[PDB]
Symmetry: C3
């Protein structure tokens, strides 16, 4: 919310939040203060009757470290686009890959869930990504109400230097080759929705040489999801099968992985919203003797109290079901439980 400018067919929306947040956990890399804020601008300009231009920026600013600390802020989203009425829309920038058009349905926990769990950011087209061109079509050309599809292309984001480089190089875990993806979602009834998404990306030579885990020329995802949202009830599930595309912690990628998320929530009238969820990620055919391994496994219980549209408080309890083993230690995968308390101002 927060329209700070609306004049002569041009609109500007300032949005964000300040999330005062603490984690409690035996895992010392997670435990402690997690206060952060987000700030963003959504902009819109009417060009003619049939054509609207738009842009959006969203910035994450950590506030949990010192004034001399490093790397405390980063861009989540930055894209510009055109909306052609009901012929669709096109934008290019740092945006969400289309797979999240479906997996977002289970990304509604009070605090945990979403990117960092069964998938991450800069993880092919599974979450936020550098350099995505995205075509979106609403209601199948104004014909079939509730039917949305999207087509997406991502250019190579390669190594810092050497043969595989681009200008915007990173480490292997956040690299991609050329890739594409597609999503499709349908509101079969009101309240009920189904969705599919697919993605295919080339992998880079660094991804196939530097880490010990994961080999193949191509990274692929296949996703199906369901969602019930009505009568103060929210149910959703997401099942995703991946090839060479799911991080096996710090050790590389899983040659194959199966990811599952399900969540159930109720919204009481006085503002309380309890939540229970289950998330797992099962990795298959890992090298170096790892074989089949749990990448992620937890039950999640929590609640959010909404004071109003601008202020809320919440607790979330991640009940970790992973067994501590040599895979979890070497890959840096947490096996401890975590409680989160937070107080949030939003604008």
């Amino acid at each position: 919310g927060a329209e700070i400018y609306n004049k002569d067919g041009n609109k500007l929306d300032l949005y964000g939040k300040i999330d005062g947040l603490h984690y409690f956990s035996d895992d010392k890399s997670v435990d402690g203060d997690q206060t952060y804020m987000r700030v963003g601008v959504k902009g819109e300009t009417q060009i003619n009757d049939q054509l609207t231009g738009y842009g959006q920026w969203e910035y994450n600013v950590q506030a949990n470290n010192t004034e001399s600390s490093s790397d405390q802020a980063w861009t989540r989203l930055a894209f510009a686009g055109l909306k052609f009425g009901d012929a669709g829309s096109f934008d290019y920038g740092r945006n969400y890959g289309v797979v999240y058009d479906v997996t977002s349905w289970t990304d509604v926990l009070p605090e945990f869930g979403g990117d960092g769990d069964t998938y991450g950011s800069d993880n092919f087209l599974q979450s936020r990504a550098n350099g995505v061109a995205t075509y979106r079509n609403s209601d199948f050309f104004g014909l079939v109400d509730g039917l949305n599809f999207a087509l997406q292309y991502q250019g190579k984001n390669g190594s810092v230097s050497g043969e595989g480089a681009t200008n915007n190089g990173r480490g292997w875990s956040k690299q991609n080759g050329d890739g594409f993806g597609t999503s499709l979602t349908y509101d079969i009834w009101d309240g009920i929705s189904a969705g599919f998404a697919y993605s295919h990306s080339k992998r880079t030579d660094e991804q196939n040489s530097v880490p010990a885990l994961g080999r193949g020329d191509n990274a692929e995802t296949y996703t199906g999801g369901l969602k019930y949202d009505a009568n103060n009830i929210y149910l959703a599930s997401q099942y995703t099968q991946t090839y060479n595309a799911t991080r096996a912690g710090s050790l590389g990628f899983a040659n194959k992985a199966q990811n599952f998320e399900v969540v159930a929530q109720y919204q009481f009238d006085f503002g309380l919203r309890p939540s229970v969820a289950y998330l797992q990620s099962k990795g298959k055919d890992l090298e170096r003797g790892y074989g089949d391994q749990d990448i992620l496994k937890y039950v999640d219980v929590g609640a959010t109290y909404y004071f109003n549209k601008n202020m809320s408080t919440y607790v979330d309890y991640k009940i970790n079901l992973l067994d501590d083993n040599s895979f979890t230690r070497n890959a840096g995968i947490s096996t401890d439980d975590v409680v989160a308390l937070g107080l949030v101002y939003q604008f």
Copy 2:
């Protein structure tokens, strides 16, 4: 000021400044361009008759280095809270330690003084800190006009890794253990005020093992202060005794220290505001032969001309009274004088 949004019980205040600033000094680490700007947002949401929610963010952006330089921006404040009428308020985030509810009375110099002098930031509850929970009460529940108090808790902010670590680790000089603090201020008249503050924090293992100077399990501060602010006159003093809490430059902490600051100012009607001040920090029982040492000692003379509420210019002259000795050289403590010239736009 600058209310850019006020609609349906939600308001948003965009504030900050642009400070065109040059230092002149024989100290090469201080001398030269010091231009920087501050930007922030104060937000408030009415929830119900008795309850208001709020948050606040403040960012510091250096502009005195190049476009390829590192670490030029950081968060000063980020916190969210609830105000329950005269039963008090609560907020959590990066915020001011309650000790500063008193020492702030002397932090009114044209340019110098404040953090970096007798205390710093991320320095237990002496200034801005990570992860403080702060309960405040004004006018003692509405029953005693001018009587304010605060109770504050701070979670451990530990090492980058090892046994003593938290998620948001930093170096020993900005670490803290679990700690609390309290403050109390009373307006005897509407210009004259007295105040006290206390804090107690656990020290971390790195604070006792890495630096040469300062040993103890606990950090403690006792602060009393006085203030006269009326009839265009401003007199203020603050006295603070510390234990294992005051930085001995880069060498560690002073086992005990005494800090004194006093300042007098006068506001002319045409907008000129002269200022004289005196500041010192005397460290005691330092290890390695140092014994008693001056940590800070200087006289300050300067003036601010206010063109209006949005624009000012100022000079400030720090006449440094430290002897250049082995302690000051080894601790990285400046012994040179400094002149500052500034032009400031504020919104």
Copy 3:
């Protein structure tokens, strides 16, 4: 620019852009996604009848790398000032060196051109610079704009030559000054001259192999035609110890020429052609004379309206790949850019 506040003689203007931008090139350090945005504030406060105060901040934020990448944002402008009626103005902070009052006339390509090409940022008083005090005057106490500018030393990180805000030798400067003069001879036709003189630093005369001298200097002259939907402009600049010879140092002398032609169609298309070169002279290590920069530029911008545009730009690199270009890390490959831009 969007006026988000205007009350009681104080105005606040929020401005910026989101630039969805892709580069294509065989030069792998240039090729790929280049999406970035800029955000700024222009503030103005009325003080009295003869005096206004103001400040401006402009921030660059890259959006083409990951959420764990580092050094992805930096301040381009940050300055506060006073304007004394029409009798001119003064400001201090990070701002444009006065040389750009003239070279800005050729900095109008769809994408390429400007800082990074014949001159750079933090490059004495040629572009954006830390710690500039700038006095400006309209109508020379008529239509004749004058500026005088001083810059304090910005020196090394540590050692003899240090200041608080130390940096590498390529972006250092000593105490310096500059002056500019521009005039509208006819309506549409402008001419301009600019001079700068700065002390070099000890690191600039000791760490890089190229460029020796106590002082850096620039002489610039420029012309501009801007009427009847036509835009022509040129810039000729001579420099001593002031132009960068890539990563190797500075050029003892250099000659930089920039020229551009453009036309603005009513329906919003704006084709552009331009030529840029930088000729370095008297280089150490046997380099002698060398091209530092040489290319033709063709492209176009389509403006949907004042807030949205798309563009293509094609850099036709004419440099020959030789020992100087390789050692100094100067690109000799072509570049194509495609972008879509939202502006507020």
